[PDB]
Design an enzyme around this catalytic site. Structure first.
Site, PDB file in Angstrom:
ATOM      1  N   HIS A   1       0.836  -1.196   0.000  1.00 38.05           N
ATOM      2  CA  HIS A   1       0.000   0.000   0.000  1.00 38.05           C
ATOM      3  C   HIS A   1       0.876   1.253   0.000  1.00 38.05           C
ATOM      4  CE1 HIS A   1       0.890   1.199   4.138  1.00 38.05           C
ATOM      5  NE2 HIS A   1       0.853  -0.090   4.440  1.00 38.05           N
ATOM      6  N   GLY A   2       0.285   2.361  -0.411  1.00 37.44           N
ATOM      7  CA  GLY A   2       0.973   3.628  -0.500  1.00 37.44           C
ATOM      8  C   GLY A   2       0.778   4.475   0.736  1.00 37.44           C
TER       9      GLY A   2
ATOM     10  N   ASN B   1       1.470   8.631   7.606  1.00 36.99           N
ATOM     11  CA  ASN B   1       2.708   8.937   6.896  1.00 36.99           C
ATOM     12  C   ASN B   1       2.857  10.436   6.721  1.00 36.99           C
ATOM     13  OD1 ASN B   1       2.413   5.977   4.836  1.00 36.99           O
ATOM     14  ND2 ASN B   1       3.677   6.279   6.661  1.00 36.99           N
TER      15      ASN B   1
ATOM     16  N   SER C   1       2.845   4.185  12.427  1.00 34.50           N
ATOM     17  CA  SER C   1       1.512   3.593  12.463  1.00 34.50           C
ATOM     18  C   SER C   1       1.571   2.175  13.030  1.00 34.50           C
ATOM     19  CB  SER C   1       0.887   3.605  11.055  1.00 34.50           C
ATOM     20  OG  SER C   1       0.370   4.894  10.742  1.00 34.50           O
TER      21      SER C   1
ATOM     22  N   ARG D   1      -5.425   0.458   5.219  1.00 33.60           N
ATOM     23  CA  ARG D   1      -4.591   1.010   4.139  1.00 33.60           C
ATOM     24  C   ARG D   1      -4.271  -0.064   3.101  1.00 33.60           C
ATOM     25  NH1 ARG D   1      -1.725   1.006   9.137  1.00 33.60           N
ATOM     26  NH2 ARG D   1       0.492   0.397   9.143  1.00 33.60           N
TER      27      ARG D   1
ATOM     28  N   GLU E   1       1.142  -4.714   9.145  1.00 31.65           N
ATOM     29  CA  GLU E   1       2.407  -4.003   9.281  1.00 31.65           C
ATOM     30  C   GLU E   1       3.104  -4.409  10.577  1.00 31.65           C
ATOM     31  OE1 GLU E   1       4.342  -1.347   7.154  1.00 31.65           O
ATOM     32  OE2 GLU E   1       5.321  -2.904   8.376  1.00 31.65           O
ATOM     33  N   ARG E   2       4.414  -4.216  10.617  1.00 24.43           N
ATOM     34  CA  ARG E   2       5.165  -4.423  11.847  1.00 24.43           C
ATOM     35  C   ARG E   2       4.603  -3.566  12.978  1.00 24.43           C
ATOM     36  NH1 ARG E   2      11.699  -3.069  12.689  1.00 24.43           N
ATOM     37  NH2 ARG E   2      11.590  -3.256  14.973  1.00 24.43           N
TER      38      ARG E   2
ATOM     39  N   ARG F   1      16.568   1.192  14.235  1.00 26.77           N
ATOM     40  CA  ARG F   1      16.430   1.175  12.782  1.00 26.77           C
ATOM     41  C   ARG F   1      17.230   0.034  12.169  1.00 26.77           C
ATOM     42  NH1 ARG F   1      18.399   6.254   9.304  1.00 26.77           N
ATOM     43  NH2 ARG F   1      20.247   5.611  10.496  1.00 26.77           N
ATOM     44  N   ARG F   2      18.476  -0.145  12.613  1.00 21.31           N
ATOM     45  CA  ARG F   2      19.356  -1.095  11.935  1.00 21.31           C
ATOM     46  C   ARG F   2      19.201  -2.529  12.420  1.00 21.31           C
ATOM     47  NH1 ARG F   2      23.773   1.852  14.951  1.00 21.31           N
ATOM     48  NH2 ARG F   2      24.318   0.514  16.737  1.00 21.31           N
TER      49      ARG F   2
ATOM     50  N   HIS G   1       1.830  -4.967   3.523  1.00 20.57           N
ATOM     51  CA  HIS G   1       2.618  -3.875   4.080  1.00 20.57           C
ATOM     52  C   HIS G   1       4.108  -4.157   3.898  1.00 20.57           C
ATOM     53  CE1 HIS G   1      -1.039  -2.486   6.338  1.00 20.57           C
ATOM     54  NE2 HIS G   1      -1.305  -3.780   6.266  1.00 20.57           N
ATOM     55  N   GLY G   2       4.908  -3.098   3.993  1.00 22.68           N
ATOM     56  CA  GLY G   2       6.355  -3.210   3.858  1.00 22.68           C
ATOM     57  C   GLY G   2       6.991  -4.382   4.574  1.00 22.68           C
ATOM     58  N   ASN G   3       6.780  -4.499   5.891  1.00 21.67           N
ATOM     59  CA  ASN G   3       7.504  -5.506   6.657  1.00 21.67           C
ATOM     60  C   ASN G   3       6.902  -6.910   6.546  1.00 21.67           C
ATOM     61  OD1 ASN G   3       9.768  -4.054   7.942  1.00 21.67           O
ATOM     62  ND2 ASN G   3       8.099  -2.719   8.659  1.00 21.67           N
TER      63      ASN G   3
HETATM   64  O1  LIG Z   1      13.665   2.477   8.336  1.00 20.04           O
HETATM   65  C1  LIG Z   1      13.181   1.638   9.156  1.00 20.04           C
HETATM   66  O2  LIG Z   1      12.847   0.459   8.831  1.00 20.04           O
HETATM   67  C2  LIG Z   1      13.031   1.988  10.624  1.00 20.04           C
HETATM   68  S1  LIG Z   1      12.487   0.895  11.782  1.00 20.04           S
HETATM   69  C3  LIG Z   1      12.600   1.908  13.131  1.00 20.04           C
HETATM   70  C4  LIG Z   1      12.309   1.678  14.451  1.00 20.04           C
HETATM   71 BR1  LIG Z   1      11.662  -0.064  14.949  1.00 20.04          BR
HETATM   72  C5  LIG Z   1      12.462   2.657  15.401  1.00 20.04           C
HETATM   73  C6  LIG Z   1      12.942   3.885  14.986  1.00 20.04           C
HETATM   74 CL1  LIG Z   1      13.161   5.089  16.242  1.00 20.04          CL
HETATM   75  C7  LIG Z   1      13.253   4.151  13.665  1.00 20.04           C
HETATM   76  C8  LIG Z   1      13.068   3.147  12.714  1.00 20.04           C
HETATM   77  C9  LIG Z   1      13.304   3.190  11.283  1.00 20.04           C
HETATM   78  N1  LIG Z   1      13.802   4.345  10.557  1.00 20.04           N
HETATM   79  C10 LIG Z   1      13.258   5.673  10.773  1.00 20.04           C
HETATM   80  C11 LIG Z   1      12.059   5.876  11.442  1.00 20.04           C
HETATM   81  C12 LIG Z   1      11.577   7.165  11.648  1.00 20.04           C
HETATM   82  C13 LIG Z   1      12.291   8.259  11.167  1.00 20.04           C
HETATM   83  C14 LIG Z   1      13.483   8.059  10.496  1.00 20.04           C
HETATM   84  C15 LIG Z   1      13.966   6.767  10.303  1.00 20.04           C
HETATM   85  O1  LIG Z   2      21.312  11.748  12.835  1.00 20.80           O
HETATM   86  C1  LIG Z   2      21.008  10.552  12.596  1.00 20.80           C
HETATM   87  O2  LIG Z   2      21.782   9.738  12.032  1.00 20.80           O
HETATM   88  C2  LIG Z   2      19.619  10.069  12.905  1.00 20.80           C
HETATM   89  S1  LIG Z   2      19.053   8.519  12.589  1.00 20.80           S
HETATM   90  C3  LIG Z   2      17.464   8.789  13.162  1.00 20.80           C
HETATM   91  C4  LIG Z   2      16.385   7.930  13.238  1.00 20.80           C
HETATM   92 BR1  LIG Z   2      16.683   6.119  12.630  1.00 20.80          BR
HETATM   93  C5  LIG Z   2      15.147   8.341  13.725  1.00 20.80           C
HETATM   94  C6  LIG Z   2      15.023   9.656  14.150  1.00 20.80           C
HETATM   95 CL1  LIG Z   2      13.440  10.125  14.755  1.00 20.80          CL
HETATM   96  C7  LIG Z   2      16.095  10.551  14.104  1.00 20.80           C
HETATM   97  C8  LIG Z   2      17.335  10.102  13.604  1.00 20.80           C
HETATM   98  C9  LIG Z   2      18.574  10.821  13.453  1.00 20.80           C
HETATM   99  N1  LIG Z   2      18.770  12.215  13.812  1.00 20.80           N
HETATM  100  C10 LIG Z   2      18.633  12.682  15.192  1.00 20.80           C
HETATM  101  C11 LIG Z   2      18.211  11.838  16.211  1.00 20.80           C
HETATM  102  C12 LIG Z   2      18.054  12.325  17.508  1.00 20.80           C
HETATM  103  C13 LIG Z   2      18.309  13.663  17.793  1.00 20.80           C
HETATM  104  C14 LIG Z   2      18.706  14.521  16.777  1.00 20.80           C
HETATM  105  C15 LIG Z   2      18.860  14.029  15.486  1.00 20.80           C
END
Ligand code: A1E1J
Ligand code: A1E1J
Ligand code: A1E1J
Ligand code: CL
Lengths: 237, 240
Positions: free
Chosen positions: B10-11, B16, B22, B61, B88-89, B115-116, B185-187
């Site tokens: 989905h888009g 978003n 979500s 969605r 979705e996850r 994230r990673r 969904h993506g995940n």
């Molecule tokens: O790109 C992804 O798959 C994921 S997953 C995940 C989880 Br769980 C917790 C958090 Cl704080 C970030 C992510 C994330 N990136 C991401 C999310 C919001 C804003 C910027 C980057």
């Molecule tokens: O600077 C970075 O590499 C990343 S990664 C990431 C992810 Br994932 C989710 C979100 Cl909400 C932010 C960031 C982020 N900036 C950042 C984070 C906390 C305070 C100030 C800037």
């Protein structure tokens, strides 16, 4: 008391509800869509919840059900589609307006067909413009030669709808699942006739309103405990 | 090939546009995400694809994406099966936070870790969470065992609960010859793609499925891809 809700779709495109739309897969008109939206708002305002939905394989009923599910925020409900809830198959009459039907077959035969419970219209023949459109449609490809109608009496329609009611819907109702059925005038006629034990003459007299939730309350034996009720504002009920 | 399988992601959703997590929150498509679904459906219509059964989640969605596709390809009559297992996850207590609230509350190091990471979940969604009853008490999950209802998920968790549905419900239909469409969904789609292609954790985390675009798999009789996934649509959209 079990709760059961029926909804009959509203207007289809190109005036086809006045043209024996039958098994032709006419879509809702914008008006028919708005009807479904209002029926769904009425179900929402009244706080109805369902557990399972049944509909036909005809897009005007399916779109009605979608519009209702959207309105009541229950798009996640299981939906079951079946040809057995299809509109009555009007055979060679399909797609003709009243005047054209009389022109083709004469007023006498038209009266007989309008009043008869068990006389079918002429079959849809290979030269009907919907013949291959319907009879070769992929959604019927699992029907046997004997199941795919070329035409139906009202009796035929009810006969093929009621086995789905008994076999698929009744068990859900008896497990307590709250059922919503979005279908067509004559398939819903079949369900109502079974529910209320109505007579042939009676059911042919019954004209279910469109786009309006029809609420039944059933006892342990799936017998209505009161007359069918309609949901909506004061004017529309 | 023996089989063809079509996936669609989905888009854009209303949340978003708010850059909010979500996950299991049942956000609707934005107008643009709805348009995307229409374009994907039109691509399927132009290619003349036919399906026999559709799978989706219990999230609107994805469901509305499926509905839009079915409308476009004039196959609204097809059977549709919805399952929480294609949701979705679940982002746990992150659900409902936007980007700034997340960075503010957890800091750069921690958000980078989440994230990673393949198998480190975000914080759990606690009973005092603003969306806890909205999600965890939603009657649509009433039949899930306590173990099944997540309070949060790692990507590993999401994939692990999606793949049983693949194995037990979708694979049978495929080997029955049914032409499957999955709108999800993506995940959860990542779970399917990882199993289809035998991808590493790292590889599946590098993979970002395009949205609103039919993803076509040609599968041999053992459901092994006989070539890379193909995106359907005009040259422009395929390129981007
Ligand atoms: O790109 C992804 O798959 C994921 S997953 C995940 C989880 Br769980 C917790 C958090 Cl704080 C970030 C992510 C994330 N990136 C991401 C999310 C919001 C804003 C910027 C980057
Ligand atoms: O600077 C970075 O590499 C990343 S990664 C990431 C992810 Br994932 C989710 C979100 Cl909400 C932010 C960031 C982020 N900036 C950042 C984070 C906390 C305070 C100030 C800037
Ligand atoms: O009043 C109704 O709802 C029905 S049912 C039915 C069937 Br079967 C065959 C036929 Cl020719 C008519 C009708 C009919 N009205 C009607 C239509 C055209 C001319 C005169 C009357
Ligand atoms: Cl559906």
């Amino acid at each position: 008391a079990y709760k059961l809700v029926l909804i009959r779709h509203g207007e289809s495109a190109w005036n086809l509800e006045n043209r024996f739309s039958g098994w032709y897969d006419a879509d809702l008109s914008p008006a028919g869509h708005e009807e479904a939206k209002r029926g769904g708002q009425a179900l929402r305002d009244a706080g109805y919840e369902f557990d399972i939905c049944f509909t036909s394989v005809q897009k005007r009923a399916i779109r009605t059900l979608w519009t209702v599910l959207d309105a009541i925020d229950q798009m996640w409900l299981p939906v079951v589609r079946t040809w057995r809830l299809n509109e009555r198959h009007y055979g060679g009459l399909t797609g003709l307006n009243k005047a054209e039907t009389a022109a083709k077959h004469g007023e006498a035969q038209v009266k007989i067909w309008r009043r008869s419970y068990d006389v079918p219209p002429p079959p849809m023949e290979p030269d009907h413009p919907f013949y291959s459109n319907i009879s070769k449609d992929r959604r019927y490809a699992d029907l046997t030669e004997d199941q795919l109608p070329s035409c139906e009496s009202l009796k035929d329609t009810i006969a093929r709808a009621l086995p789905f009611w008994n076999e698929e819907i009744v068990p859900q109702i008896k497990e307590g699942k709250r059922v919503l059925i979005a279908a067509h005038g004559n398939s819903l006629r079949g369900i109502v006739k079974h529910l209320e034990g109505l007579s042939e003459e009676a059911i042919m007299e019954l004209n279910l309103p469109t786009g309006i939730p029809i609420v039944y309350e059933l006892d342990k034996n799936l017998k209505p405990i009161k007359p069918m009720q309609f949901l909506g504002d004061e004017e529309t009920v």
